[PDB]
Amino acid sequence: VGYAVLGGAAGFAATALGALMALGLRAISARTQDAMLGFAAGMMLAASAFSLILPGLDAAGTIVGPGPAAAAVVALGLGLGVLLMLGLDYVNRVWLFVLTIILHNLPEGMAIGVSFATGDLRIGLPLTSAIAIQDVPEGLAVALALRAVGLPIGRAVLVAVASGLMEPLGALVGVGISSGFALAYPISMGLAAGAMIFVVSHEVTATVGLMAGFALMMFLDTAL
Residue 89 marked in a binding site: yes
104 is in an annotated binding site: yes
CA distance 116 to 4: 6
Positive/negative CA dihedral, 161, 137, 97, 151: positive
Q: Was 58 annotated as part of a binding site?
A: no
**Where does residue 87 rank: exposed (0-12), middle (13-18), buried (19+ CB within 10 A)?**
exposed
Q: Is 108 annotated as a binding residue?
A: yes
Structural domain spans, the chain = 1-224
123 closest CA partner among 210, 54, 212: 54
Please provide the DSSP assignment of 104-164 as one string.
HHHHHHHHHHHHHTT--HHHHHHHHHHHHHTHHHHHHHHHHHHHHTT--HHHHHHHHHHHT
Q: Tell me whether residue 44 is annotated as binding.
A: yes
34 is in an annotated binding site: yes
Other C-beta atoms lying within 10 Å of the C-beta of residue 68: 10
92 labeled binding residue: no
CA R_g for the chain: 17
36 labelled ligand-binding: no
